[PDB]
């Protein structure tokens, strides 16, 4: 996260760390959506153009965490993956269309003060919150500057951007399965996800029922926190039918 701040303890209890067993390193973010299901981006697990192809036994999930590196005993919970489900029409060849994956934990995780699932949006929620200029929240342990990791989980709040503005900031072909977020050069504030934050949640707090909803998945961007560029997020609601038949 660029231009963010430390998260508070318990601020993002759905945040999941996808940790590479060997070599020991942060692979991606993810989110907890049930006691046994974790949501992430498909390209965190599968990206042939960079020879990336991770199976269940390559990865560990670490849930409840705050420190990027310290074992948090009686706070964090480690888990192993039963099965990985990548969207059948995930387009790794071009633009990362349908950048979504689900992961089943080998055993369900007990919830706690630090571990708690995020909601997925309904149609009513998606319609009320997915409006240009409304701010979501992005969290992760990714890099603080373009291409230098934080001590603890970082947080930044970012506005959803009008679709024609998103499409005009990039040469990439943008699909209805993506939205973009970020401040514009003349907005005074800044902030972005960066390397390491991929697959984490873009969440919004409903003013109607006080609950946090995962509206997006950290998918891709051009640089980190560049003027005139914006982060692109998987449009979670539009893919809910696929999320459905997996569980």
């Amino acid at each position: 996260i660029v231009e963010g701040s430390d998260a508070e303890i318990g601020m993002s209890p759905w945040q999941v760390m996808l940790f590479r067993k060997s070599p020991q390193e942060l692979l991606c973010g993810a989110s907890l959506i049930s006691d046994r299901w974790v949501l992430t981006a498909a390209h965190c697990l599968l990206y042939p153009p960079w020879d990336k192809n991770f199976t269940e036994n390559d990865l560990l999930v670490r849930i409840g965490k705050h420190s990027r590196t310290r074992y948090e005993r009686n706070i964090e919970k480690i888990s192993m993956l039963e099965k990985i489900y990548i969207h059948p029409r995930y387009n790794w060849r071009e633009n990362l269309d349908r950048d979504i994956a689900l992961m089943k934990l080998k055993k369900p995780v007990a919830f706690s003060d630090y571990i708690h699932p995020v909601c997925l949006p309904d149609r009513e929620t998606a319609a009320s919150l997915l409006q240009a200029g409304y701010k979501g929240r992005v969290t992760g342990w990714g890099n603080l500057k373009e291409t230098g990791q934080p001590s603890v989980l970082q947080v930044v709040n970012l506005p959803i951007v009008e679709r024609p503005v998103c499409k005009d900031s990039t040469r990439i072909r943008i699909t209805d399965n993506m939205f973009c977020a970020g401040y514009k050069p003349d907005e005074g504030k800044r902030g972005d996800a960066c390397e390491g934050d991929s697959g984490g949640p873009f969440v919004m707090k409903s003013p109607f029922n006080n609950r946090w909803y995962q509206m997006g998945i950290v998918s891709w961007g051009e640089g980190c926190d560049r003027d005139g560029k914006y982060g692109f997020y998987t449009h979670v609601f539009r893919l809910k039918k696929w999320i459905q038949k997996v569980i």
């Binding site: 990439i172 891709w220 961007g221 539009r238 893919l239 809910k240």
Partner: peptide, 24 residues
Amino acid sequence: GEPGAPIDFDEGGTPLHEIPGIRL
């Protein structure tokens, strides 16, 4: 006020990896 993404369900171009500084 303006929708940032459509509320229906899911039913060429340059590849991301060719963009300089691409963040994945």
